[PDB]
Tab-separated table of N, CA and C in Angstrom:
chain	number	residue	atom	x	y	z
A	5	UNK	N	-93.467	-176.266	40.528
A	5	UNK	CA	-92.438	-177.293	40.455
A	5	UNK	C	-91.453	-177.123	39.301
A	6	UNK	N	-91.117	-175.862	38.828
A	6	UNK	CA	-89.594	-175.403	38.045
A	6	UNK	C	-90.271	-175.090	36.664
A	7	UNK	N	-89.843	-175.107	36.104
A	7	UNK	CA	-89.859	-174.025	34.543
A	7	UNK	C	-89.297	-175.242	32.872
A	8	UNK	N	-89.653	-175.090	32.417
A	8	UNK	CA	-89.220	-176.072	30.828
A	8	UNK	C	-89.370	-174.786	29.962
A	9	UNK	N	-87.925	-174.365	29.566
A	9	UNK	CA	-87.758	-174.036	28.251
A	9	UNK	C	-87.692	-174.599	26.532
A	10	UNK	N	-88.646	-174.294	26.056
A	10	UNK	CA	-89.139	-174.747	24.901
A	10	UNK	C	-88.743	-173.862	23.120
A	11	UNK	N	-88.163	-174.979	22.432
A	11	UNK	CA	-89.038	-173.875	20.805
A	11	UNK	C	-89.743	-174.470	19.986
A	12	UNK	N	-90.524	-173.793	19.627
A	12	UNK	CA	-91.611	-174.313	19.021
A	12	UNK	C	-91.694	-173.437	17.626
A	13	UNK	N	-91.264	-174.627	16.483
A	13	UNK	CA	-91.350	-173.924	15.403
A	13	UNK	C	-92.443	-174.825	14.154
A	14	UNK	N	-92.536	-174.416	13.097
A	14	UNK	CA	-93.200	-175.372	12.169
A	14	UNK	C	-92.629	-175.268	11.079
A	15	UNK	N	-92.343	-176.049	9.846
A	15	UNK	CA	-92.140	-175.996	8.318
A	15	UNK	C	-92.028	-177.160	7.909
A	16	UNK	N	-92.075	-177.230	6.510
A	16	UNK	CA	-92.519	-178.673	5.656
A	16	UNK	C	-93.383	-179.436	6.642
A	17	UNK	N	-94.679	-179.096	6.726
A	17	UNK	CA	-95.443	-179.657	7.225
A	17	UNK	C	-95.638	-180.534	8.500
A	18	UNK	N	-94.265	-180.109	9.515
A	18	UNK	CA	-94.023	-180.362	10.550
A	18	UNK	C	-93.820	-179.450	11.792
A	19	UNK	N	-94.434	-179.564	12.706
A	19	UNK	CA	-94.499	-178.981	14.331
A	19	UNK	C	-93.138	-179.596	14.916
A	20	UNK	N	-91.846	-178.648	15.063
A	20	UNK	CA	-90.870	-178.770	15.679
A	20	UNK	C	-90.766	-178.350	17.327
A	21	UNK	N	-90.471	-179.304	18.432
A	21	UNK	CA	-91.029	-178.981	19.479
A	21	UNK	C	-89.301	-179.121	19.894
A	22	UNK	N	-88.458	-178.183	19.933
A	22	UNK	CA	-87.007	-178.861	20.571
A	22	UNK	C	-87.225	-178.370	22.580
A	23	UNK	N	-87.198	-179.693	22.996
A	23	UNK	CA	-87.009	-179.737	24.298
A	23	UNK	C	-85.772	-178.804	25.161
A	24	UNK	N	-85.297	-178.165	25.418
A	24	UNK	CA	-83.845	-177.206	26.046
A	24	UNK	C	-83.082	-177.915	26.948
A	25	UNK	N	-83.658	-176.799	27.928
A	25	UNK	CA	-83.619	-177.325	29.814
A	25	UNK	C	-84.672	-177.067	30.839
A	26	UNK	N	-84.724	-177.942	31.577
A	26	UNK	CA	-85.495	-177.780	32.942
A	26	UNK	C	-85.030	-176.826	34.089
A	27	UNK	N	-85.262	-176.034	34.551
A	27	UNK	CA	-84.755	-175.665	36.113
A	27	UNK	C	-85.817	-175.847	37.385
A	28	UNK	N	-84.964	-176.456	38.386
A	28	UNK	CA	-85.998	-176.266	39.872
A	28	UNK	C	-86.899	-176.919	39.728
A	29	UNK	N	-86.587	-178.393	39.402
A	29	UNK	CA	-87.308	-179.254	39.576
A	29	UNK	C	-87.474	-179.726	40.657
A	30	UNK	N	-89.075	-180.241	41.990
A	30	UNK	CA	-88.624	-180.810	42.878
A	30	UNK	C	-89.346	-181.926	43.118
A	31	UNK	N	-88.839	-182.607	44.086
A	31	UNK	CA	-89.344	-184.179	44.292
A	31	UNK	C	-89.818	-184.297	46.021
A	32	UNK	N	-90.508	-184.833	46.501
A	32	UNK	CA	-91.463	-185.131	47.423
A	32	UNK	C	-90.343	-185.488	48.754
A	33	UNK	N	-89.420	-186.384	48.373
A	33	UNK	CA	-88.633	-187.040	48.820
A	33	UNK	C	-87.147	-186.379	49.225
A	34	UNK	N	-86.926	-185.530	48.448
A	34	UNK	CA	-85.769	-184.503	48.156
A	34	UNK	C	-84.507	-185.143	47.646
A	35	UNK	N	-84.668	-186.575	47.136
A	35	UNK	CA	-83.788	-187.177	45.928
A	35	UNK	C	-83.533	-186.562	45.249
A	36	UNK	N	-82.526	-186.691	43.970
A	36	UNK	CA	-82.930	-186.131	42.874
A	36	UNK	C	-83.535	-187.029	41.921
A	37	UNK	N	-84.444	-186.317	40.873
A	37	UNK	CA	-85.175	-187.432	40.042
A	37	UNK	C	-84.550	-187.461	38.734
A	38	UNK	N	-84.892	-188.546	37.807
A	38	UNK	CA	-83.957	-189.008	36.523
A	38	UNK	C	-85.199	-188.522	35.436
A	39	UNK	N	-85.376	-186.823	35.070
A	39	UNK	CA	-86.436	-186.649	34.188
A	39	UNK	C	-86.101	-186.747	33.149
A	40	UNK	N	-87.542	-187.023	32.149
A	40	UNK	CA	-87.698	-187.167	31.002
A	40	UNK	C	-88.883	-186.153	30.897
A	41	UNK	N	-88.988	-185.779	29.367
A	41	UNK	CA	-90.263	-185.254	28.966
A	41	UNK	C	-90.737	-185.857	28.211
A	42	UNK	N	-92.218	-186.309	28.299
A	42	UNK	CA	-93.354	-186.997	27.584
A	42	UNK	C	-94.035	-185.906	26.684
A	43	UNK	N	-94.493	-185.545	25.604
A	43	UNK	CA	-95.765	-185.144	24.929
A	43	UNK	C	-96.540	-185.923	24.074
A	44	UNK	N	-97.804	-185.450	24.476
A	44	UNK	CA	-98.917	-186.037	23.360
A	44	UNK	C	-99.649	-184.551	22.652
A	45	UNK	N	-99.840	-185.135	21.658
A	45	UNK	CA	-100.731	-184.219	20.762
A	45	UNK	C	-102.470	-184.068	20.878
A	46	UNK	N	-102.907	-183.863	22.075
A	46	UNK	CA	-104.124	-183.562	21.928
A	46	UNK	C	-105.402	-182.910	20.971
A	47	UNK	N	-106.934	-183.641	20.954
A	47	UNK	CA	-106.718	-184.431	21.639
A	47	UNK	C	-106.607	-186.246	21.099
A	48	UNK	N	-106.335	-187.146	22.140
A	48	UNK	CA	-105.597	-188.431	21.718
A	48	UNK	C	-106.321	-189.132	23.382
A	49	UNK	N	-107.438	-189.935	22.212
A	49	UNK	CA	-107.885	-191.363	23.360
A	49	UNK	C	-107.119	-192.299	23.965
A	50	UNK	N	-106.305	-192.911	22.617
A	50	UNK	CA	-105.576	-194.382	22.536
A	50	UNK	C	-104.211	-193.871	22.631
A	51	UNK	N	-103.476	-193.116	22.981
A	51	UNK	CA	-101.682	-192.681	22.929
A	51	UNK	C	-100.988	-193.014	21.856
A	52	UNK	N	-101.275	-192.618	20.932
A	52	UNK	CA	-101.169	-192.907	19.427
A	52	UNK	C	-99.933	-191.882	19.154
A	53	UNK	N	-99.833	-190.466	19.577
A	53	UNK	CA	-98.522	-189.213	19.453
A	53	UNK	C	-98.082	-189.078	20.460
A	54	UNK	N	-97.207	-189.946	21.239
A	54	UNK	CA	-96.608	-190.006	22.101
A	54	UNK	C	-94.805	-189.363	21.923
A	55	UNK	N	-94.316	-188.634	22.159
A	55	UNK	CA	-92.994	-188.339	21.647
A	55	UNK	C	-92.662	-188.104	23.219
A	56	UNK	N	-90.919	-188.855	23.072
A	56	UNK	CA	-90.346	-188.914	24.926
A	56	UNK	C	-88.937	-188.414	24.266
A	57	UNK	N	-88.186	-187.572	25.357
A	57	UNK	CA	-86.665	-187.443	25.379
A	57	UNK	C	-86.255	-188.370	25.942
A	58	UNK	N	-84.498	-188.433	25.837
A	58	UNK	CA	-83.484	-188.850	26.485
A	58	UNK	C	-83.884	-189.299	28.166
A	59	UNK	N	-83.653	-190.018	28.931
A	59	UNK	CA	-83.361	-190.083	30.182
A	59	UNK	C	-82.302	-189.069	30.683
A	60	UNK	N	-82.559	-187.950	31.451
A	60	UNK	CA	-81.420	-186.950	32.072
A	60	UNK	C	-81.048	-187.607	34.051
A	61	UNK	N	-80.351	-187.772	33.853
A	61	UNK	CA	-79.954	-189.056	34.904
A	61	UNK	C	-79.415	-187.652	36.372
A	62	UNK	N	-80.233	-188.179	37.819
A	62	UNK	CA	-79.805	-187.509	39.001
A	62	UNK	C	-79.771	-185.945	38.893
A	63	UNK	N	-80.696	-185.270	38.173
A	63	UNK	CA	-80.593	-183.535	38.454
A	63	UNK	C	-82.098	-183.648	38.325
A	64	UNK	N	-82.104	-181.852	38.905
A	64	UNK	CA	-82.989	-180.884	38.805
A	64	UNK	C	-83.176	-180.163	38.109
A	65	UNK	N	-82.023	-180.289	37.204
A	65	UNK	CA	-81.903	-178.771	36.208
A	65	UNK	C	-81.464	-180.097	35.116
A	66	UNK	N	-82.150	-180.297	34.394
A	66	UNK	CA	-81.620	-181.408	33.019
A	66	UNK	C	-81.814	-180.246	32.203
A	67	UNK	N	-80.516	-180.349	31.088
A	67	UNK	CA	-80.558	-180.355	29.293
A	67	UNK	C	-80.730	-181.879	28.712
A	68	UNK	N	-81.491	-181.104	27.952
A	68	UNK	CA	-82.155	-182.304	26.992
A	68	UNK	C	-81.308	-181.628	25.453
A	69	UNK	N	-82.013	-180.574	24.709
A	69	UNK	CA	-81.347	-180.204	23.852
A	69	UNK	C	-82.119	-181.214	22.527
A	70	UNK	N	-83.165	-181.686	22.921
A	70	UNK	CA	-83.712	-182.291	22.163
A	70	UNK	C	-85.087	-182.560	20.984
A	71	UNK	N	-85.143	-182.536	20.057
A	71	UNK	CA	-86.343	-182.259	19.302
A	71	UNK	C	-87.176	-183.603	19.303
A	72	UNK	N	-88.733	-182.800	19.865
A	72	UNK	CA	-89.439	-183.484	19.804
A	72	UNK	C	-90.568	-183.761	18.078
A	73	UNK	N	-90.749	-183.810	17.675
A	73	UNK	CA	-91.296	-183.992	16.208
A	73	UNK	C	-92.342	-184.598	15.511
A	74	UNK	N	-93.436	-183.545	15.293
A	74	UNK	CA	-94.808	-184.245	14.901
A	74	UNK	C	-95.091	-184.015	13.209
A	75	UNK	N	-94.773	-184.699	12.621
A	75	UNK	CA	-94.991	-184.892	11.238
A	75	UNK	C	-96.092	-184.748	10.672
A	76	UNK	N	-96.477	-184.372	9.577
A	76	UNK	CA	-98.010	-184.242	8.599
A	76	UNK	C	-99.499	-183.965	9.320
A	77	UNK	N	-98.902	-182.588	9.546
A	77	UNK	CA	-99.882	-181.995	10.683
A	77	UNK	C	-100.365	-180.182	9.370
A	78	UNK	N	-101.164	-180.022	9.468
A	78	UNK	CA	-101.112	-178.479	8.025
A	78	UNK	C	-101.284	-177.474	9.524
A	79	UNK	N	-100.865	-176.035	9.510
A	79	UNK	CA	-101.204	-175.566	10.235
A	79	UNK	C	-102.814	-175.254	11.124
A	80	UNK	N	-103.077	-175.146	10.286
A	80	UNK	CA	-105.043	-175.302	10.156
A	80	UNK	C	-105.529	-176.866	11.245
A	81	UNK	N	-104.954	-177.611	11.276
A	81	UNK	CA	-105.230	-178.883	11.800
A	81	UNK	C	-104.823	-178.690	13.679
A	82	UNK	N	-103.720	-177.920	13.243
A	82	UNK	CA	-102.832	-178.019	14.617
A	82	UNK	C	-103.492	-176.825	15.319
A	83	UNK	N	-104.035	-175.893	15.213
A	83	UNK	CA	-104.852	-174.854	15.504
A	83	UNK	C	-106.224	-175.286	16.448
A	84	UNK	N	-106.274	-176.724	16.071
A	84	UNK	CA	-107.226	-177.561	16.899
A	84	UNK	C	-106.559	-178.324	18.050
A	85	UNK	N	-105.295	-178.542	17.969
A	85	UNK	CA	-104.689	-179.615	19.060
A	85	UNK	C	-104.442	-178.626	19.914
A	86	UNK	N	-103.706	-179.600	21.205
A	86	UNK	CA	-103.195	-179.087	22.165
A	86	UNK	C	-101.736	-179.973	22.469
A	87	UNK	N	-100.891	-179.328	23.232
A	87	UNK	CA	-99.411	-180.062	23.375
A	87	UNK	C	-99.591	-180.197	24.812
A	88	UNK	N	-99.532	-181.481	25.390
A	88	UNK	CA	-99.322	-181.980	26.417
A	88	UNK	C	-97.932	-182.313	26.849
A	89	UNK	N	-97.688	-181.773	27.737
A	89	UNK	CA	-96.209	-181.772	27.837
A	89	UNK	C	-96.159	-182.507	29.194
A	90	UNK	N	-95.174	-183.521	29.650
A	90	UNK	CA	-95.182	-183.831	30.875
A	90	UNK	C	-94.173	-183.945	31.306
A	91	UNK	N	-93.056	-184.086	32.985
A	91	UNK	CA	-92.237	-184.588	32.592
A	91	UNK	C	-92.208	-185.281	33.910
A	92	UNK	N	-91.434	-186.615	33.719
A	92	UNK	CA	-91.293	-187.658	35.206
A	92	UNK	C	-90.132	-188.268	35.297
A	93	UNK	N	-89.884	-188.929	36.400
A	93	UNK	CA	-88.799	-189.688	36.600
A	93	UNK	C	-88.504	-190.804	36.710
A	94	UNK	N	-87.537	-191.341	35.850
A	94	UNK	CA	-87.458	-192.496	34.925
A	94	UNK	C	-86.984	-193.477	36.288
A	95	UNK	N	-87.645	-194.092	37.406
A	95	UNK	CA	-87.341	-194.883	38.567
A	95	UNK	C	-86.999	-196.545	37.837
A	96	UNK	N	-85.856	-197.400	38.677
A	96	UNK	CA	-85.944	-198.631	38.593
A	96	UNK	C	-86.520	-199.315	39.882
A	97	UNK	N	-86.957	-198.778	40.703
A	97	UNK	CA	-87.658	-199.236	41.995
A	97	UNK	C	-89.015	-198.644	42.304
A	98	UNK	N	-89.559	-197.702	41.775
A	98	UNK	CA	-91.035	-197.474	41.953
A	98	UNK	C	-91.750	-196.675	40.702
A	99	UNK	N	-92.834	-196.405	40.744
A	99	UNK	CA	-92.901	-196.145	39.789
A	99	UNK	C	-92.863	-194.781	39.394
A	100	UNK	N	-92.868	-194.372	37.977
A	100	UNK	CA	-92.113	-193.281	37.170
A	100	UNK	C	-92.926	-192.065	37.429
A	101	UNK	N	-92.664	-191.253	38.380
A	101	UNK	CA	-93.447	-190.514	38.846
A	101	UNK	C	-93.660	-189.165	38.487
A	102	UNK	N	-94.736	-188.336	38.510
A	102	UNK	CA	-94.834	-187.591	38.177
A	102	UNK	C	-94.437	-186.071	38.267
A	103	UNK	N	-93.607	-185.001	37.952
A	103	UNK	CA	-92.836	-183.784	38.068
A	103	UNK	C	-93.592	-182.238	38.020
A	104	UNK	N	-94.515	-182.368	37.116
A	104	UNK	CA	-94.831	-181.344	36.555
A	104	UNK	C	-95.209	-181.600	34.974
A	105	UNK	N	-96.254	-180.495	34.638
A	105	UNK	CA	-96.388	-180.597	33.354
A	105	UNK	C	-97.271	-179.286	32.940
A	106	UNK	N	-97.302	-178.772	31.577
A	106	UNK	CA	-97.777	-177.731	30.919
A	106	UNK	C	-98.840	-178.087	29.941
A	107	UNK	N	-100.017	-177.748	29.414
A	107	UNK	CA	-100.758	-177.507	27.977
A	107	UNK	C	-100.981	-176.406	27.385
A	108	UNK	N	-100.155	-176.828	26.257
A	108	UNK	CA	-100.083	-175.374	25.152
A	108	UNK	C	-101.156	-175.639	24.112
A	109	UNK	N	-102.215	-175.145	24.197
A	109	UNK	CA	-102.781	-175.083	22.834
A	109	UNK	C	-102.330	-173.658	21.360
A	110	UNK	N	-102.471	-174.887	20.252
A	110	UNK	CA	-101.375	-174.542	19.303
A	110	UNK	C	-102.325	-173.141	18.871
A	111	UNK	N	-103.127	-172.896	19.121
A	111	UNK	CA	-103.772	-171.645	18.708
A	111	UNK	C	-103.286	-170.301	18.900
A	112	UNK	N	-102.330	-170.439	19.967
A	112	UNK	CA	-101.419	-169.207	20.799
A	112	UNK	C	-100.222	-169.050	19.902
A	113	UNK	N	-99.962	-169.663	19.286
A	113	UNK	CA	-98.366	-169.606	18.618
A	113	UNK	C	-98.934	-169.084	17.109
A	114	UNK	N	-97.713	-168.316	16.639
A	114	UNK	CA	-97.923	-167.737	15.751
A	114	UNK	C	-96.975	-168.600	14.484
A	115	UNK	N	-97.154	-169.655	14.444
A	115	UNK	CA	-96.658	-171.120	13.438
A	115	UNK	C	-95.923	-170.511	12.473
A	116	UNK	N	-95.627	-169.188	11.444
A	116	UNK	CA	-94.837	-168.572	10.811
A	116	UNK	C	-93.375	-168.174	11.223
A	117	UNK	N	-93.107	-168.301	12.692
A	117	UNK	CA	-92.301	-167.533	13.587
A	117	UNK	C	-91.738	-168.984	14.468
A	118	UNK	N	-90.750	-168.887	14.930
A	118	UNK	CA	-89.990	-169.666	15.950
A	118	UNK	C	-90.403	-169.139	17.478
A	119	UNK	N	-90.673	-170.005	18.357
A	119	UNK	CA	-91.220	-168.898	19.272
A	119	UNK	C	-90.631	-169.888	20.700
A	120	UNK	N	-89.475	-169.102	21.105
A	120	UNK	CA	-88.502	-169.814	22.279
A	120	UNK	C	-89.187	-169.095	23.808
A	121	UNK	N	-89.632	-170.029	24.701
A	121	UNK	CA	-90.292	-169.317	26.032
A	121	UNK	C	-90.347	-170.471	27.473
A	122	UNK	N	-89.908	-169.982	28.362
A	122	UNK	CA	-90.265	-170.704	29.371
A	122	UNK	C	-91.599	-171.085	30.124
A	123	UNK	N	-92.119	-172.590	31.135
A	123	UNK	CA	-93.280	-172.283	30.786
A	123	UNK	C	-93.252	-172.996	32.187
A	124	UNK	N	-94.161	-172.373	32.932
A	124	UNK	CA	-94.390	-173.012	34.383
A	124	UNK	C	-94.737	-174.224	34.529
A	125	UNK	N	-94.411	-175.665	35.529
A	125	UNK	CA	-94.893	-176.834	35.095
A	125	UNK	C	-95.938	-176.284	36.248
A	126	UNK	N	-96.630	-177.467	36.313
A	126	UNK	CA	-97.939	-177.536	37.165
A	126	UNK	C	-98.374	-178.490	37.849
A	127	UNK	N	-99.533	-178.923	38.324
A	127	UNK	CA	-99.836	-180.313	38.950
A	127	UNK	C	-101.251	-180.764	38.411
C-alpha cells in the first residue's frame, strides 16, 4: 500500500524523524484519503510518545516535509525502542482509517549519520 520516505537523524540528545512524502497510497473504496502520519516510540502501553503530522488533504502522494521529534532519548536508550510509524485518513464521516504502516527498530540505524530511505507500508 505505497512507500514513506523518511530521515532519520539524531543530535543534542534528540531522534529527528522528518516525515517527506508518501507515494501510491491506496484506499478500499478508491476515494482519495486525507493522510496523516502517526508515530509512537516503542515500546509504549499508555500512548504517552505519540507524534502526528499535518493533515495532507485528498491525495495519494502527500508531502508532509515535516519533523517528527523525540526529545531526551541517549543513543544507548533508543537502541532498545522501536518507531512505529502509521499513517491514516483524517475522515469527518467515518472513522480514521487505516493506510499502511512500517516498524523501524532503532538498532538498524547508524545514529552518527543522517540516514534518508524509503520504506514499504504494510498491513
Amino acid at each position: 500500500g505505497g512507500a514513506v520516505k523518511l530521515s532519520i537523524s539524531y543530535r543534542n540528545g534528540t531522534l529527528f524523524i522528518m516525515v517527506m512524502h508518501i507515494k501510491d497510497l491506496v484506499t478500499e473504496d478508491g476515494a482519495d484519503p486525507n493522510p496523516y502520519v502517526k508515530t509512537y516510540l516503542l515500546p509504549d502501553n499508555h500512548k504517552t510518545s505519540k507524534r502526528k503530522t499535518k493533515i495532507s488533504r485528498k491525495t495519494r502522494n502527500p508531502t508532509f516535509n515535516e519533523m517528527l521529534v523525540y526529545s531526551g532519548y541517549s543513543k544507548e536508550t533508543l537502541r532498545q525502542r522501536e518507531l512505529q510509524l502509521s499513517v491514516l485518513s483524517a475522515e469527518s464521516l467515518r472513522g480514521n482509517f487505516f493506510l499502511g504502516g512500517v516498524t523501524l527498530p532503532l538498532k538498524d540505524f547508524n545514529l552518527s549519520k543522517e540516514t534518508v530511505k524509503w520504506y514499504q507500508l504494510t498491513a
